[PDB]
Design a protein around this ligand. Sequence first.
Ligand code: 3PE
Ligand code: HEM
Ligand code: HEM
Ligand code: ZN
Lengths: 487, 460, 29, 386, 117
Amino acid sequence: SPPPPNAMVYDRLAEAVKAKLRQLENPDPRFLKYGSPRPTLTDHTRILAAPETRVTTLPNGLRVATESSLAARTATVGVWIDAGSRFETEESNGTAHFLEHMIFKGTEKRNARELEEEIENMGGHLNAYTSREQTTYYAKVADKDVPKALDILADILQNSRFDENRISRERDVILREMEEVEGQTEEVIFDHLHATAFQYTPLGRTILGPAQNIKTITKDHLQNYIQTHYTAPRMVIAASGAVKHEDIVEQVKKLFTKLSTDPTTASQLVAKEPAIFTGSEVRMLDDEIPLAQFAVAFEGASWKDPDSIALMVMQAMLGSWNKTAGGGKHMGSELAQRVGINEVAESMMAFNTNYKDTGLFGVYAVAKPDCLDDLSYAIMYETTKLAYRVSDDDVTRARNQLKSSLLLYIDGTSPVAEDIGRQLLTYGRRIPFAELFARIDAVDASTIKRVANRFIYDKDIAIAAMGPIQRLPDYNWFRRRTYWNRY
Amino acid sequence: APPLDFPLPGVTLPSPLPDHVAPGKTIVTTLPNGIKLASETSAGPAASIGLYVDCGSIYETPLTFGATHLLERMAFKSTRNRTHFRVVREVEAIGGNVQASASREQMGYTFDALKTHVPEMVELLVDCVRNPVFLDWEVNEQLLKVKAEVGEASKNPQDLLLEAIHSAGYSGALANPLLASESALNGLNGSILEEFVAENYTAPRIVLAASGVEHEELLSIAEPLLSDLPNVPRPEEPKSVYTGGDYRCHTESGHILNGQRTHFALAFELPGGWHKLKDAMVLTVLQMLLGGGGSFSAGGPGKGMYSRLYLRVLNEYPQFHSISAFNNIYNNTGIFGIQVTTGSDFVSKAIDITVNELLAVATSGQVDQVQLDRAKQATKSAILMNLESRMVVSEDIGRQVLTYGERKPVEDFLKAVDEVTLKDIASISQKLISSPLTMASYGDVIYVPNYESVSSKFRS
Amino acid sequence: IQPTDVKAAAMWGVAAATGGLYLIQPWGW
Amino acid sequence: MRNQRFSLLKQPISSTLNQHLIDYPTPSNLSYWWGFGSLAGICLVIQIVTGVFLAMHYTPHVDLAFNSVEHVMRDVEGGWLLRYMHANGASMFLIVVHLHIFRGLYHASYSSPREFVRCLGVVIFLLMIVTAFTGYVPPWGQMSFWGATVITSLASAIPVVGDTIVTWLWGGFSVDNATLNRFFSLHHLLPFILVGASLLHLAALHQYGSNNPLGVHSEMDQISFYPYFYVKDLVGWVAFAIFFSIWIFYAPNVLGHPDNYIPANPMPTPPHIVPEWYFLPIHAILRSIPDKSGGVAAIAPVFICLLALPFFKSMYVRSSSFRPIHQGIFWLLLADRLLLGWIGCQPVEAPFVTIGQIPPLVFFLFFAITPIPGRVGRGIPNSYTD
Amino acid sequence: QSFIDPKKNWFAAQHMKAISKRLRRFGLRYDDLYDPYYDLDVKEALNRLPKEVVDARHQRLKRAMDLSMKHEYLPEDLQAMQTPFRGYLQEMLALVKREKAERESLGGLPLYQRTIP
Ligand SMILES: CCCCCCCCCCCCCCCCCC(=O)OC[C@H](COP(=O)(O)OCCN)OC(=O)CCCCCCCCCCCCCCCCC
Ligand code: HEM
Ligand code: HEM
Ligand SMILES: [Zn+2]
């Protein structure tokens, strides 16, 4: 009496849908033999073996470390220095960045043109970068030609000279460089955050320095700065790839001389005038901008503080989300799940910055001006739930992720040498892989709760926002959202 | 736990590796159904595992345009055996990173983690590539994402010019679009992608490649899973020819008052691609010799700021924004050209300067020997430093085995680079300037000469 | 997860009982 | 926006009334069982007006209350009309609300997303019962005195606090003038709380719309409220007025006990003490138990079950039209509830003890059974499919 | 179930005959009575189905509501041409519930939540 199941349009489509759902039903065990979605803690002792890190201090007090591996055809050499933008006087602020830009153009024995043609002819190149507490000059070169690179490095570090017309053209290009740092606003937000969370202390200042100061930066400042802060004990010479420790130490003992021997260590410059975290906010309102950016941050741990490992585990378990990621709404952490399901942001990225004697720990989201309060609510809810009721699968997953990230980042010779230099400046020694793992898997739910109570629970905050932020909750809202009255 | 400058007491340490480690040899294994399994061993604790397929953007009939972009977007999602939740949550459980990529000739899937996780990585990758199911709601979400991106995909003029060049200068399969257009997007759904995958992901066109896995592990793991793909003979490759052409699209009137830049390029071809090996590396070292430079960079003085083009254009002409040179060496064919952005009035003058530079490079007697040696050394150093990452090594193994059938070692390539002389570069350039000219302009165009004026300067 | 919740429930019960013995002050009980 | 005004009915001044009375969308197949909410609203308004005008001639004292009621009926112009409207409108109000409740039970209106409406309705029912019982006292007859005694001394069955709360409630040692004046003040106060609860009830319903005799999604075919359901409400109101006035004018004492025309005398007891006709089911359930604690704590399951119906979460079909077994259970429950009503007005001996103890068992088996159909029928599509 | 089935139990065939009669007289399928405001998973199950099936559902619902308002029933021929119990929604609903459970087990937040009234 009724039509057959094929006579009408909707019946056929319904049958097709049920056919697909049928062909989704039964799985195959042989494709489900080795993997599980439940995190577990596993030991990696039999793969963590790696070559040695020969460190040889010298009678002048200049440490030298190498990670020798004699199968490669390239090597990298550099000079990490324990000086940076923290150690200026607010009347010569950007002197470090200026000195970095200028050290590449003197060297009376070989003029600038000679420098770049020489480095280009062999096929290698060298870089340089600075920060608030470190400065780097490293040369990536071919294995056959390490001694030439070492000679270049020694000469540019020691016998540099500075000229007035050189000064003028460099100050013009640096004024330009300042003029194009304002178009990305992530570094603008972070400069404002660092200059309000650390007001009236050396960490407040910016790396570039005021344009009121870049104009009056003549050679006297450069010479005094290089003779004061570039001393023998505050330098480390590193090298990875295909090198030999004994040759390198030979010509290091031969070429590296004439260094100023000053009795001034970084620790005894940081001991007086330390970093003090206050807690404030800066709200920049423009309203002609389509998107709003803001960051909220507590205080943190030091380099040698034992709790920095737990802080990094926490940052891993408060992960990052982005609108073009493959996770979506299935991304493990609860904060990323809330942001992804409710579509209340463009991107968020928890951060963790360490220093000697202080640190920071925050979130930094970006979103439309009509979802700001929901975003802030979710952010603070998860930030406090860490201190209240941290689970166990979360902690195992976060420990796994931290292990994988830390090891997978080490790849090549530049990362290896950068690791060696940075760690020899911060910890005074290079942490092996085994000790780092044994420290990482020693953080449990109880330790997460304890450290969160120490750092997160009912402490002050620092906020920095920019754009159309007329719907962002005030400071008292954020301050009061650091505890729960139900417990 | 003491402070981090005090060693932890009870840690267990492993056995340190020697200072010299003997390098491994690539081992290639082929199965009766035609699939190839490669591997290698590395000193690092991390293993990168990939998968490559011969399918690509040129295997697209008029009905399935823009399918490969979604195949990139529908990479690791609901399969026949586990859901999208399971896939994401396992990958995060072990800590690995997973990606995918598409180009005009071949597809790629990648998955890397720590070395103790090899069987899990292999199983997940083979499952996510071999047995997918394309449910409609996920496809709709991805199509919405693609349309939203296309609504703002004009911020990258370089890829826009590259696609315009590959459209105008070519007429065969290599003229197909890679970044898709709205009509195909309205035409795509689950069934189209399903049929595309079913047709083009056959056994003889697949190859694994491991960069940190001893051969026995990966072989004993991949035999049970990858031995069931049925046997089918590889269909022949489509045909592309190089013709002249011209393309033109003045920028939007919503960009004119701001002083919109001008963007234009040139092109030529070489009859044989990677199969003309000694020709290919001559073309590469010629590319390094011409080099290029945007003049807006601040990097290390060794990034190629003594190339011919930089020295003889930028240190003299302040109107230019960014000169450059590129290449695209496909299978059996290649492409060489020059692309520049500059002020919008200086266009025909820029054409003049580029023409003079190419002509000077073409003839024999104008190129110094020290410049040739500099370019050779820079090329050798660049490739040696590029082979240092594990991911690059895995990609090299996979692509080389796809294109040839065996990994030709680094020594062969270096020896080939040593085979460059002024006669060889002169001859290759003469072969290069004996082909139709291609142009593609974008920006302030009503001031630009036509194809007639700029074709008149060159030969046939 | 259970222990913290149940301890908080017990302490809230203690608070409720203390409030009740504040509103009413019976020495006969 | 509409940069110049169009209508007075869409201005801010009349936006609320317009949106919630005139333009509100309702299903187009609502039947006559959906008028009793408005009809009960009108009943409440009638009660309030009539009471505010009776309370101008009534004196709350033990010496004067009876004589002041009789003064109203015999010496004030039309006062007999006021008293008869009040004393019969209480009964009409209870009748209408009972029909409302059984409508809600039939088409399963308590389920999601309308359980806040059901809970507020139960609270309203409690307030109604308290108000009527407190207000049956002020005439100070025989049944007023003895009903107050029995019901309010039923609160000493509770453990240790019992006698204390009974004595605090009575304001003394027995039901006397203090209780009378207290109850008068409570009676004048409670109906305004009733008004507030009714308005909250209506807001809670309007935030999701009403159900319909089908129990399906109803967002594709809706019509406004005016003039399509205003006229249907009008028909209902006129029929109700005819019924109410038949009660007032030609039989104003059929719905009461004759003993309340005898002034209160604490020494002699009436031979058969009962409350009004709309408390007899509770009264029968209450005397059905041969234990004070059990009898008092058996009312609590009644209100707990009535307040916990909405939270069973497996049934998928709402209307009883497509549910034969639940429909039969509905009719059988109705019969049993009437049986409790009739039993609540009889002497306590054979054969009424068994017939007073079993109907409570049935009245609780109703609220126990219904989830079992929920489960057993959740899996019905898989068996009967074609 | 041993006794729910109409094949072996004579007190279930009668039940299905009654339900099928009452569904035919208004011309709508048994899956039409599930409400998206009730369960909040029927909303997803219906959201994922193809457009034509949902459109047929809306049209059938409107037809039945018009019939109820007019106080009449479909003619006998359009009653013979009716198929209740021809499901279009069970499998999708079961699948959505399976994903919900599997997500609940491994931690994870809900994807959509009922609102407080
Ligand atoms: C006589 C003595 C009486 C003493 C008190 C006795 C109480 C007995 C009541 C027993 C019945 C159980 C009540 C349980 C309430 C909560 C149960 C519940 O299901 O809530 C959850 C539900 C939403 O949660 P859901 O989405 O389902 O879960 C997500 C899982 N991923 O939540 C919802 O769906 C929201 C529903 C809200 C509607 C109910 C609100 C409470 C009832 C309102 C009446 C109170 C008004 C009183 C006004 C005057 C106040 C004095
Ligand atoms: C003064 C007492 C009451 C008033 C004024 C009142 C009024 C109303 C009104 C006006 C409506 C909407 C219109 C309608 O559907 O007819 C309604 C709906 C409703 N009422 Fe009441 N009511 C009262 C008592 C009760 C009680 C005691 C209950 C339950 C124990 C109850 C349960 C309900 C339910 C379930 C609905 C839902 C309507 C629907 O399903 O469409 N009401 N009420
Ligand atoms: C402001 C609101 C009210 C006031 C001022 C009021 C006033 C009064 C007064 C003064 C009496 C005693 C007069 C007499 O008994 O003849 C009375 C009796 C009574 N009231 Fe009210 N009343 C109000 C509302 C209500 C409501 C809402 C109800 C029921 C829902 C109700 C039910 C009764 C009953 C049943 C009597 C008994 C009268 C009798 O049986 O003789 N009253 N009221
Ligand atoms: Zn710089």
